[PDB]
Amino acid sequence: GTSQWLRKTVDSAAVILFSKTTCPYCKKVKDVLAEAKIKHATIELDQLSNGSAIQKCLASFSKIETVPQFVRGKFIGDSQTVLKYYSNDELAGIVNESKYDYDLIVIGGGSGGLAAGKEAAKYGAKTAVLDYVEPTPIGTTWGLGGTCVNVGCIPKKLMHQAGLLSHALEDAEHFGWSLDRSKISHNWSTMVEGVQSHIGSLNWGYKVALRDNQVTYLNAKGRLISPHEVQITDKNQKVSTITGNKIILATGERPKYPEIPGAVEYGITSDDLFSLPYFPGKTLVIGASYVALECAGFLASLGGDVTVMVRSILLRGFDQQMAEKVGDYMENHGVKFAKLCVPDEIKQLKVVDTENNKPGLLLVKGHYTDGKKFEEFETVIFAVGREPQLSKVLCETVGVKLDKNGRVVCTDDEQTTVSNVYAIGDINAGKPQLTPVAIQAGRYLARRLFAGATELTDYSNVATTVFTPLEYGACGLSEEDAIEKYGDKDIEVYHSNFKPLEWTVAHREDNVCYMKLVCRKSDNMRVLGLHVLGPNAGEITQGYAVAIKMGATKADFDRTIGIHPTCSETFTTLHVTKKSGVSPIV
């Protein structure tokens, strides 16, 4: 038991020191390692639940039981032995002795891979991270940091914010400011400049941060040819093979395209939208996911003429009453919808004018589910899902098992069917596809491999926010999911409309914002899911995700007092139930 942990820890750690805080002979070793620039993990025996057993158990490797004791599985010595290697100039060569080039190779430099790399490096692991950005069909490309940094959460929430500031210009007049919203316009390329300027500063920050943790950054495409061999390819095409003890796969996903004529040739995806040199103009967004809705939302707030093509429903997998309230708000505020509709081909009427910086022109043809026809836009953005391309990363012969969708099947500690290879982030099968999830898995995984830790990532009840023009925050089950799992008779739902105080003087709507709490009667009225639609929904929801992790019930919400003038306080006084039939309005 304790036997198996210690044998595991001593085998994968690069440089580890077993120690005590009060021990003086250990501080002498720490000081030598500190002085010689030797990074290492450290286990202070005197603060562990079974430090006595561990100390006795260490003798099985070192034939001693005292407490200043390891490099890559090999016992090195006590303080006397280590000082002697130090004095005689032998110490640096033993700590670099390795069967492989790196203790860890990370394939993919995004939210999870950068986070796993930086954490391993802190415990002495010799570490390389690989990153390469295959261009889009028109050639768009970007720098280190992954999908969120460059073409995901960071540029889309900045663009969300450009769009919110438009209603702030509307609201300012009613609070007494002299401006006239009706004679202000928005300049797209000015906005893209500021957004890209911030993205480039993150590109630079990550490069600076790997340099300062002594992580090798290879800007190269990687391929696992064998359990410890990674084939890399240069920007000059030069092919080479590096070796690593532990491999972490963290290569993420890219957007899909429908198999129709003109899709790849004349349409774009979100990959291209966030650095586009011209304003998209009259835009058709094809899709109904959060990417499609979020992008269609801010393009509308920035003045554009915007249509969304919906195959079946909005936001599949999320609570469908909230999805529809989200949709009704957008449809009431500009965004147009072609419902139960699908595209059949894109034809080109004008080519993109690179000179004068202008979009092209396109004819879009399709049909509705009843057969009726759909038939002009300047930009077509496809947002019809995302997928990994592991055939380009992972030679079949290696042995890494995949599920039917192309994602990696992993144990609950991120390990693949090949004992030294792990996977994190979007390509980990059945996990929430979110940046904060990728970062926590990567950091905890790196501590287990090189520092003796045991903590797992908890993937249950992870909160979300959809940054549509009115935001929608969620934590836990949807309403339909709770009923499907426990029966309607066992589910109680408390809900209420509300109106932000900032909307009163601005003459905004009375009962569009909405929140609800999905509970379980038989389990002391346990909160199964939380849903809020309104401004700052992400800030509202986060704090509640902690109490749900702790098993919060309706009583825990009742007995907590609200903070006044806020929207979030409405959760602390909810009382109208859906079965009561009472109206939720204010």
Ligand X SMILES: Cc1cc2nc3c(=O)[nH]c(=O)nc-3n(C[C@H](O)[C@H](O)[C@H](O)COP(=O)(O)OP(=O)(O)OC[C@H]3O[C@@H](n4cnc5c(N)ncnc54)[C@H](O)[C@@H]3O)c2cc1C
Ligand Y SMILES: OC1CN(C(c2ccccc2)c2ccccc2)C1
Q: How far is CA 396 from CA 141, 245, 260, 274, in A?
A: 28, 20, 30, 35
Catalytic residue among 198, 333, 564, 575: 564
Nearest CA to 308 out of 407, 222, 383 is that of 383
Using an 8 Å Cβ cutoff, are 442 and 112 in contact? yes
The sign of the torsion formed by the CA atoms of 76, 82, 88, 92 equals positive
Residue 339's binding partner, choosing from ligand Y, a copy of itself, ligand X, none, with beta-carbon cut-off 5 to 8 A by kind? ligand Y
CB nearer to ligand X: give 54 or 242: 242
CB nearer to ligand X: give 6 or 159: 159
Neighbours of 166 (CB within 10 A): 18
Neighbours of 511 (CB within 10 A): 13
Using an 8 Å Cβ cutoff, are 266 and 380 in contact? yes
Q: What is the DSSP string of 244-268?
A: EEEEEE----EE---SSTTHHHH-E
CB nearer to ligand X: give 42 or 389: 389
Query: What would the x/- binding string for ligand Y be over residues 339 to 368, using CB under 6 A?
Result: xx----------------------------
For position 18 contacting ligand Y by CB under 6 A, the verdict is no
- Confirm or deny that 156 is annotated as ligand binding: yes
Using an 8 Å Cβ cutoff, are 240 and 101 in contact? no
Q: How far is CA 545 from CA 109, 462, 533, 540, in A?
A: 28, 7, 16, 10
* Interacting residues of 520 by C-beta distance below 8 A, sequence separation 6+: 482, 486, 490, 491, 492, 526, 528
Using an 8 Å Cβ cutoff, are 231 and 225 in contact? yes
Residue 314's binding partner, choosing from a copy of itself, ligand X, ligand Y, none, with beta-carbon cut-off 5 to 8 A by kind? ligand Y
Burial class (CB in 10 A: 0-12, 13-18, 19+), 87: exposed
Catalytic site residue 564? yes
CB nearer to ligand Y: give 262 or 327: 327
Nearest CA to 247 out of 489, 424, 436, 14 is that of 424
Residue 88's binding partner, choosing from a copy of itself, ligand Y, ligand X, none, with beta-carbon cut-off 5 to 8 A by kind? none
Q: Which residues bind ligand X (CB under 6 A)?
A: 107-113, 130-133, 146-148, 152-153, 156, 221-222, 250-252, 270, 291, 392-393, 425-426, 433-436, 438, 564-565
Residue 251's binding partner, choosing from ligand X, ligand Y, a copy of itself, none, with beta-carbon cut-off 5 to 8 A by kind? ligand X
d(CA 306, CA 285): 7
Residue 107's binding partner, choosing from ligand Y, a copy of itself, ligand X, none, with beta-carbon cut-off 5 to 8 A by kind? ligand X
Within positions 282 to 311, which residues make up the interface with ligand Y, using CB under 6 A? 310
Name the phi and psi angles at 225, rounded to 5: -90, -25
Pick the binder of ligand Y from 70, 337, 382, 498 (CB under 6 A). Answer: 337
User: What secondary structure letter does DSSP report for 577?
Assistant: B
Residue 435 one-letter amino acid: T
Residue 392's binding partner, choosing from a copy of itself, ligand Y, ligand X, none, with beta-carbon cut-off 5 to 8 A by kind? ligand X
Q: Least Å distance between CB 250 and a copy of itself?
A: 17
CB nearer to ligand Y: give 141 or 312: 312
Q: Least Å distance between CB 38 and a copy of itself?
A: 21
Q: Least Å distance between CB 368 and ligand Y?
A: 10
CB nearer to ligand X: give 148 or 210: 148
Nearest CA to 394 out of 374, 414, 409 is that of 409
Q: Least Å distance between CB 112 and ligand X?
A: 4
Using an 8 Å Cβ cutoff, are 147 and 110 in contact? yes
- Confirm or deny that 284 is annotated as ligand binding: no
Would you please indicate which residues are annotated as catalytic (active-site) residues? Answer: 564
* Residues that constitute the known binding site: 20, 55, 67, 79-80, 111-113, 131-132, 147-148, 153, 156-157, 221-222, 224, 251, 254, 287-294, 311-312, 316, 385, 389, 395, 426, 433, 435, 481, 507, 558, 560, 564, 572
* Residues that constitute the known binding site for Mg(2+): 481, 507
Interface residue list for ligand Y (CB under 6 A): 310, 313-314, 320, 323-324, 327-328, 331, 337, 339-340
